[PDB]
PDB file of C-alpha atoms in Angstrom:
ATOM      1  CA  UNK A 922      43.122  -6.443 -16.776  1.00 18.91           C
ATOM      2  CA  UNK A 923      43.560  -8.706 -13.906  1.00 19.12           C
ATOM      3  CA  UNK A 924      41.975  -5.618 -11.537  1.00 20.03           C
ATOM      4  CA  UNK A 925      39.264  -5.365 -14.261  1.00 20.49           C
ATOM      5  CA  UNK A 926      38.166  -9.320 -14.494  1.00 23.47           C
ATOM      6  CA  UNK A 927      37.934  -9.807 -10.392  1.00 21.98           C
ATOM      7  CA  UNK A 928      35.960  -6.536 -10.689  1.00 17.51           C
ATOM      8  CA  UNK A 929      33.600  -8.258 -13.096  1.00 17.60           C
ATOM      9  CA  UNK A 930      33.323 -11.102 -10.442  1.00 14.25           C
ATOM     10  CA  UNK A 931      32.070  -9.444  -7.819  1.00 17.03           C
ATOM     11  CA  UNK A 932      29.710  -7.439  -9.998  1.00 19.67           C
ATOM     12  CA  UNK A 933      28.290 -10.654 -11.197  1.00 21.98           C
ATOM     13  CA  UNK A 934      28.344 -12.322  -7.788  1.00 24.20           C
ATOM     14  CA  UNK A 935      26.837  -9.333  -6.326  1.00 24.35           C
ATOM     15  CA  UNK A 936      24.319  -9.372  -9.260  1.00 23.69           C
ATOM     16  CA  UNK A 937      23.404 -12.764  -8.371  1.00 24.36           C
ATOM     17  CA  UNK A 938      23.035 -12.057  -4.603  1.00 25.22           C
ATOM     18  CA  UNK A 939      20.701  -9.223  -5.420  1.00 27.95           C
ATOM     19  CA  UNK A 940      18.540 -11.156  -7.298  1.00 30.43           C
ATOM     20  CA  UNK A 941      18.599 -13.883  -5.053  1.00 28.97           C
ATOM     21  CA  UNK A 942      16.959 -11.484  -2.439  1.00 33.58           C
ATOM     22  CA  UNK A 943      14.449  -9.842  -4.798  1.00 32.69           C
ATOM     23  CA  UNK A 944      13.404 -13.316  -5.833  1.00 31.52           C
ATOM     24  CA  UNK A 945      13.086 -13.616  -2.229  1.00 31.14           C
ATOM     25  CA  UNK A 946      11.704 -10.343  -0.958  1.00 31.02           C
ATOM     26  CA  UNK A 947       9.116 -11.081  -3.650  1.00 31.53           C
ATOM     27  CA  UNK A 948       8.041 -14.300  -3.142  1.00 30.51           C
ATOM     28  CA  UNK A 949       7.825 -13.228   0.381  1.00 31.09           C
ATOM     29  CA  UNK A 950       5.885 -10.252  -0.036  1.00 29.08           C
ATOM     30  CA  UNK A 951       2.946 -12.174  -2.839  1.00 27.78           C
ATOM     31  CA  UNK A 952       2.617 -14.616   0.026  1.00 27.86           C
ATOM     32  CA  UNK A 953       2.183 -12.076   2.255  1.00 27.70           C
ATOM     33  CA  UNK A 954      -0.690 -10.166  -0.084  1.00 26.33           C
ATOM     34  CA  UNK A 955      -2.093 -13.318  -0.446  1.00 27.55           C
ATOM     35  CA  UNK A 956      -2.074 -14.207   3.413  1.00 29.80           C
ATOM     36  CA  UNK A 957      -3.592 -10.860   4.271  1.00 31.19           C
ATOM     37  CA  UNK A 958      -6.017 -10.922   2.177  1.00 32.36           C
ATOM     38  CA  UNK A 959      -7.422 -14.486   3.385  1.00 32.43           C
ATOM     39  CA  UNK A 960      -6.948 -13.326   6.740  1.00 31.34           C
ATOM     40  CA  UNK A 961      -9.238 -10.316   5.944  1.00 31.10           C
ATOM     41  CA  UNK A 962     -11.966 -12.188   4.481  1.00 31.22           C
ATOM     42  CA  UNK A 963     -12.094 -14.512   7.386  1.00 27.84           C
ATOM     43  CA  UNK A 964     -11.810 -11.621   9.925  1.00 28.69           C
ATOM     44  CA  UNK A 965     -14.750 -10.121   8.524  1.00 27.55           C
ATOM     45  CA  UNK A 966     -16.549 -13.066   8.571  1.00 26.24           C
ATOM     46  CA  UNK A 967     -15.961 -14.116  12.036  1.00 26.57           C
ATOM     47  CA  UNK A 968     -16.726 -10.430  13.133  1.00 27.20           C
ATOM     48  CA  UNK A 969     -20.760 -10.448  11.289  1.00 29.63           C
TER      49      UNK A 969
ATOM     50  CA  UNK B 156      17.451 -12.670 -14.775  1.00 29.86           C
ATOM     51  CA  UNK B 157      13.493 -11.511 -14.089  1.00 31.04           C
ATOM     52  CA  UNK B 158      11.487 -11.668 -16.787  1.00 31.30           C
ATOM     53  CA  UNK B 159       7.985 -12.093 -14.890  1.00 32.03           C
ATOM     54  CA  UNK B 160       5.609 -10.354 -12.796  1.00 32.32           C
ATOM     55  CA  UNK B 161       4.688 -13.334 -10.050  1.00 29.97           C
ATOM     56  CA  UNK B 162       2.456 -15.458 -11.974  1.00 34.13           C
ATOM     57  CA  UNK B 163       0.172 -12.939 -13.257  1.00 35.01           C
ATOM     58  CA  UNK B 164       1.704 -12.357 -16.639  1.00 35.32           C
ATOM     59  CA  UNK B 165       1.351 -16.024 -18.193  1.00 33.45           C
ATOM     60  CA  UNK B 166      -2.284 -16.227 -17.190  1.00 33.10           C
ATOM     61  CA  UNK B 167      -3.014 -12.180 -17.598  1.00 35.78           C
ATOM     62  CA  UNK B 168      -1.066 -12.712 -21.250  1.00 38.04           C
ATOM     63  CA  UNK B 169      -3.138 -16.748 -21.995  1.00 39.37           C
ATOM     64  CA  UNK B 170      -6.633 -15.021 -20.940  1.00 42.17           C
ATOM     65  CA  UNK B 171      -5.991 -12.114 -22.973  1.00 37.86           C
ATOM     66  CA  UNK B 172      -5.241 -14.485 -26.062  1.00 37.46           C
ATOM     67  CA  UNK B 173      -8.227 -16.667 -26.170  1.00 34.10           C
ATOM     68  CA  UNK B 174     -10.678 -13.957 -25.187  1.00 34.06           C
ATOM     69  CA  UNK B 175     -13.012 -14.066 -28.030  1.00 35.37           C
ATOM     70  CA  UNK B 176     -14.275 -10.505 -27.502  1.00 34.43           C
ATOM     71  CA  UNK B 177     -14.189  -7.512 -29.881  1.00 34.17           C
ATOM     72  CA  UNK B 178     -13.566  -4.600 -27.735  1.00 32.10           C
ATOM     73  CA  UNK B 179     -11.275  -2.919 -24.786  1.00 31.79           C
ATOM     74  CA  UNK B 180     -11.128  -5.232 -22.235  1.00 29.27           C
ATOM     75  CA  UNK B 181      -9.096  -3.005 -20.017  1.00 30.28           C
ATOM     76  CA  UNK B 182      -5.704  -4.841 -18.290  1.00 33.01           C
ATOM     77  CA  UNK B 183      -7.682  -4.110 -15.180  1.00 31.09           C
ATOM     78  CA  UNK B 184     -10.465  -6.631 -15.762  1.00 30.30           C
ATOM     79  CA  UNK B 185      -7.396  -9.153 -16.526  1.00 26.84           C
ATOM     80  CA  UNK B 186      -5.592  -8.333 -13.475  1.00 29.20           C
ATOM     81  CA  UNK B 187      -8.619  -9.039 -11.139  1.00 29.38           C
ATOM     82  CA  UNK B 188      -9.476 -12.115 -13.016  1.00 29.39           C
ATOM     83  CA  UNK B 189      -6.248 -13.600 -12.956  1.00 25.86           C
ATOM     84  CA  UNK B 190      -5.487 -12.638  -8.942  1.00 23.83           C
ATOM     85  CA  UNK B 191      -8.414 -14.913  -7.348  1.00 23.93           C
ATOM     86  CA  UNK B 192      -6.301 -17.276  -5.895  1.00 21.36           C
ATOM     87  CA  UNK B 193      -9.026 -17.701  -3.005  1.00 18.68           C
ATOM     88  CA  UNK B 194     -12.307 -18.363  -4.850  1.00 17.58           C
ATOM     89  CA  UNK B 195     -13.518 -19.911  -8.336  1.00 21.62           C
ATOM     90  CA  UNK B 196     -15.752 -17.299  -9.140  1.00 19.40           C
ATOM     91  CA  UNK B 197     -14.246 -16.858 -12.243  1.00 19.32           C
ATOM     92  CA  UNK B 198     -13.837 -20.052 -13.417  1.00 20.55           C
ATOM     93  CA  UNK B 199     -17.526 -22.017 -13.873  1.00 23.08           C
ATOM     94  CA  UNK B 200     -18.839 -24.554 -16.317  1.00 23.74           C
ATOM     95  CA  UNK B 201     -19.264 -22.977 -19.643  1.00 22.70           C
ATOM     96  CA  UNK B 202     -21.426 -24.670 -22.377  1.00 21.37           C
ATOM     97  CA  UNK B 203     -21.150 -21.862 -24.755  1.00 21.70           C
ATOM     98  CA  UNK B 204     -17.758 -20.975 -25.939  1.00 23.76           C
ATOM     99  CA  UNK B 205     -18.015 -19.085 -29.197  1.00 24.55           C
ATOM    100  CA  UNK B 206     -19.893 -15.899 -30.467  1.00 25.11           C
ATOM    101  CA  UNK B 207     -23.328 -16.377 -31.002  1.00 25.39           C
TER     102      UNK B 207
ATOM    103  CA  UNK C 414     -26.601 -28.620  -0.748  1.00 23.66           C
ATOM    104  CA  UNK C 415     -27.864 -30.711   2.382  1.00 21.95           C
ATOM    105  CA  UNK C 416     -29.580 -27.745   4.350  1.00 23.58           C
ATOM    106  CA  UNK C 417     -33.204 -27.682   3.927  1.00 24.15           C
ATOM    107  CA  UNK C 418     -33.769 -31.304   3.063  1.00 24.70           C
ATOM    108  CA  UNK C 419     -35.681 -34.567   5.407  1.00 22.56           C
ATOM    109  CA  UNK C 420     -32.570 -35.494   6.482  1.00 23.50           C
ATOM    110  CA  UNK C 421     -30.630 -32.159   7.019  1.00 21.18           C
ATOM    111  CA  UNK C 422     -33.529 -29.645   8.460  1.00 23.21           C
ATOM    112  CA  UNK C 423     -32.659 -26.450   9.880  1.00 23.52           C
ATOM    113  CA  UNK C 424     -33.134 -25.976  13.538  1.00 21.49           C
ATOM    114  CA  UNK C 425     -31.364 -25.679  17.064  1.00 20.33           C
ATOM    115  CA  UNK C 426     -31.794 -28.863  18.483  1.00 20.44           C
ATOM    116  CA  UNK C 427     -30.674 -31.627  15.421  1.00 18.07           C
ATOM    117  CA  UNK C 428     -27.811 -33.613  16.422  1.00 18.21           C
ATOM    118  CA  UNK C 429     -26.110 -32.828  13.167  1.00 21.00           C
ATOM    119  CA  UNK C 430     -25.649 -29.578  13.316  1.00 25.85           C
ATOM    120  CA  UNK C 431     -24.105 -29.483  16.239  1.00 24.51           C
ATOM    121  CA  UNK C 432     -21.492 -32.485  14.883  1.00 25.34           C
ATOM    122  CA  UNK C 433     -21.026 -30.638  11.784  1.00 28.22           C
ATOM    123  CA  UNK C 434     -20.390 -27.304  14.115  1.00 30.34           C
ATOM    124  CA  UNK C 435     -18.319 -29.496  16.921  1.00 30.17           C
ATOM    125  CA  UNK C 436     -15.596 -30.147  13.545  1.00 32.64           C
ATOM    126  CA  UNK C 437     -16.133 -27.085  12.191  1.00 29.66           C
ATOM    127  CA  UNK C 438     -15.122 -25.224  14.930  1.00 28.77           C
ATOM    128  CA  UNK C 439     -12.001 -27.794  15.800  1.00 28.60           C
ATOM    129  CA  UNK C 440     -10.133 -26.960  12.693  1.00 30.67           C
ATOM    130  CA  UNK C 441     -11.463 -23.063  12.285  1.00 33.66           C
ATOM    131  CA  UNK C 442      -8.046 -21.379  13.484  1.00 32.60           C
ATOM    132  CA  UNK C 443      -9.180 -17.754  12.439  1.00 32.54           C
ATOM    133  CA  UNK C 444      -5.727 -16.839  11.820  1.00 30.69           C
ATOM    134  CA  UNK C 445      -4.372 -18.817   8.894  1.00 31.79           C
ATOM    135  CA  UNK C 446      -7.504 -21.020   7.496  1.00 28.99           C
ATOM    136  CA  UNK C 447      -8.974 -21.118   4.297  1.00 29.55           C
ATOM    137  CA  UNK C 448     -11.917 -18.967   4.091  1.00 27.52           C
ATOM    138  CA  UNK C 449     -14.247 -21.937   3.409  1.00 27.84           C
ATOM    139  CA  UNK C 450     -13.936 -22.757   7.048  1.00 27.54           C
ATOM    140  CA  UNK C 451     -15.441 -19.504   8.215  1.00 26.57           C
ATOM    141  CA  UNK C 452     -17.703 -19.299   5.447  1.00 26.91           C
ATOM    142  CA  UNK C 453     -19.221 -22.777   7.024  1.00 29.63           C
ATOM    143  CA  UNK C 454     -19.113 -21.183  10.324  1.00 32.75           C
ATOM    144  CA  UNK C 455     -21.374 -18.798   9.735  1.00 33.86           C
ATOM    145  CA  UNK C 456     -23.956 -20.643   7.391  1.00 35.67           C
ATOM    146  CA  UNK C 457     -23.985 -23.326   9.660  1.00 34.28           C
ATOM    147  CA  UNK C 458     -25.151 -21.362  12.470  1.00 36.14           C
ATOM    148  CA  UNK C 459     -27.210 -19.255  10.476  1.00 40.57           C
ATOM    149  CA  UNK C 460     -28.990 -22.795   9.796  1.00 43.93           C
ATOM    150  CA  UNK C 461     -28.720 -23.576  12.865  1.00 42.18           C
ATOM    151  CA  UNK C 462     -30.875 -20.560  14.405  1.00 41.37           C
ATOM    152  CA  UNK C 463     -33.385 -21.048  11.335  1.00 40.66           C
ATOM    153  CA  UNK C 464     -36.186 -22.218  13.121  1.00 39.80           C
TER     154      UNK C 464
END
């Protein structure tokens, strides 16, 4: 039980971790989209 | 833990609500509405707000 | 809004044009702006070569 209970630990703090870096990887990658896009629009504009 | 799609879902989900159409209104239409986030040209001054 | 009017009239040679342009073109970064800064770029020089 004792062997069970740590393992429940480190599945929850490796649950947490994970969704600590999805949070991240996705906050990154809207702000990314969003970047691109604005740097599309002005690319095209500054191009005409 | 996640439980939403960036901030899409809220607005997708509120502009879907109070819609006042009778029809399809695919999700598409929603999604490209709700994913400006550079220009207004969705959002204007609008006098008339129910069916004729 | 302005463009067009007495006191804005297109043209090469008004003085604020070129002021509007000489900001316009000191913040413009063309990398990470907001598009309303290249969107006055361009209609301010299109205005600008409006005769």
């Amino acid at each position: 039980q004792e062997e069970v209970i740590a393992l429940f630990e480190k599945c929850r703090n490796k649950y947490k971790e994970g969704q600590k870096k999805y949070m991240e990887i996705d906050e990154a990658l809207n702000r990314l989209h969003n970047s691109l896009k604005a740097r599309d629009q002005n690319y095209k504009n500054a191009e005409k | 833990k996640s439980i939403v799609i960036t901030s899409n879902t809220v607005a997708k989900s509120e502009l879907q609500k109070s819609i006042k159409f009778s029809g399809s209104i695919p999700e598409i239409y929603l999604d490209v509405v709700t994913k400006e986030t550079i220009s207004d040209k969705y959002k204007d001054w609008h006098f008339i707000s129910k069916n004729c | 809004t302005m463009y067009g009017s007495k006191f804005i009239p297109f043209g090469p040679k008004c003085q604020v044009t070129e002021y509007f342009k000489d900001c316009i073109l000191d913040i413009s970064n063309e990398t990470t702006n907001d598009v309303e800064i290249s969107i006055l770029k361009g209609i301010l020089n299109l205005f600008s070569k409006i005769r």
